[PDB]
Amino acid sequence: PKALIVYGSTTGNTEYTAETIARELADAGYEVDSRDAASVEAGGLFEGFDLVLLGCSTWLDDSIELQDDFIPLFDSLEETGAQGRKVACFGCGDSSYEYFCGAVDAIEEKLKNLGAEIVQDGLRIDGDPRAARDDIVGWAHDVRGAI
Template sequence: MKDVLLVYASMSGNTEAIADLIEEGLKEEKVNVTKIDVIDCDPDMLNAFNAIVLGAYTWGDGELPDEFLDLYDEMATLDLSDKQFAVFGSGDTAYEIFCGAVDLLEAMVEERNGVVAQQGLKIELSPDGEEEECKEFGRQFAKTVNLKTSV
């Protein structure tokens, strides 16, 4: 059984609701999930897992929320080689840059030699009506992680 770290930032509860649904999908595939708010995430936790899901809402003009900035800055000092990531987030298409936080996190993972194992999940505001898509995102990541690590 694989272990996945799921780190998220949520202000209104939308991104946390997405994280809960992704967690359900992961667990359906028999994956152990450690879900944690980014404020409580020590950067060393990223070193302890080989499969990591990151989630953040987009703030302002396509930016990461303030509570994600410390971890993001710490990620710039880590070697994420041999680690597989999936990134998700919530945003608002009323802004010019939709879900820019997802793009920023994926770029950081790749810059630090991590593997973005699947296309990021971008949800308009809340997951209402997209619950199955969120669960499938978790299921697909679990399948990808299991395939990559099988002998």
């Protein structure tokens, strides 16, 4: 099976999370393509992939709390080929904030409005992902089992 992983990361936490998930999928036999959201084009982005995993950090704001590199993709999510696609979301944040990992909720809700099939509840990481490595691996393991 082929999996696409797209992440938006400012300090490297969601990027570390994306690379950890990519290894667990590859070691289970999937062909994995991992890309920074700053370098992708939304048009037909998901065409040909069996599983798509989307990740991003949360930054408090009055208009949009998504990490800046992911905004352009999010705004054009309707042109990616999400209808009927198997997808799951993940993201890093901090529970001292009101909207803890709020970007994960925003992405799940829009994918749901576009007809995607959310395979598993989103992974929400508090603090340093390097200390939550077991939670990342287990989630990756559970997403493989819903495919």
